[PDB]
């Protein structure tokens, strides 16, 4: 599923991301845009051989099992394929664990390099949520 901007903002809000660990909704929308272009089916291989999955590009190195990431963990206790569903529940719940891990949204390098410090409210501007 490729979400529209405001449709994903509304969904992430419904799923409890707005101000989660202090990160306003536009932070999550901005991260999703640059991670996945709002595509739940997005996959990208990392240099180390792990892969990132779904709207928020959750890495198999730590968070999900894909059967091909040596020495990795599965801290969200989910197959990585679950992260590609049109239903964002698994992605959101796993993201909650990630952002609570100590470095907040800096876990998402694209968030750090492209969203942090910027006017992230622009991502939800005009949206019926």
| Among 40, 57, 59, 72, interactor with Na ion by CB under 5 A | 72
Among 126, 94, 119, 128, which Cα is nearest to 24's?
119
Phi, psi of 51 (to 5 degrees): -135, 150
* Interface region with Na ion, contact rule CB under 5 A, candidates 5-13, 14-22, 39-47, 65-73: 65-73
Query: Rounded CA gap, 84 and 6, in Å?
Result: 19
What is the contact surface with Cl ion in residues (CB under 5 A)? 5, 11, 24-26, 69, 87-88, 104, 120-121
Query: Rounded CA gap, 103 and 127, in Å?
Result: 29
Q: Which of 7, 18, 35, 119 is catalytic?
A: 35
Q: Does 60 bind Na ion (CB under 5 A)?
A: yes
**Residue 76, binding choice from Cu ion, Na ion, Cl ion, none, Cβ under 5 to 8 Å by partner class:** none
| Helix count and strand count (H, E) for the chain | 4, 3
Does 66 appear as a known binding residue? no
Q: Which residues bind Cu ion (CB under 5 A)?
A: 10, 129
């Amino acid at each position: 599923k490729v979400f529209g901007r405001c449709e994903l903002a509304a969904a992430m809000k419904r799923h409890g991301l707005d101000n989660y660990r202090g990160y306003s909704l536009g932070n999550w929308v901005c991260a999703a845009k640059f991670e996945s272009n709002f595509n739940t089916q997005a996959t990208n291989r990392n240099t180390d051989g792990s892969t990132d999955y779904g709207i928020l590009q959750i890495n198999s190195r730590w968070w999900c099992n894909d059967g091909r990431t040596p020495g990795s963990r599965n801290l969200c206790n989910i197959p990585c394929s679950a992260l590609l569903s049109s239903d964002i529940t698994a992605s959101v719940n796993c993201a909650k664990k990630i952002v609570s891990d100590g470095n907040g949204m800096n876990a998402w390098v694209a968030w750090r390099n492209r969203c942090k410090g910027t006017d992230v409210q622009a991502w939800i501007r005009g949206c019926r949520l």
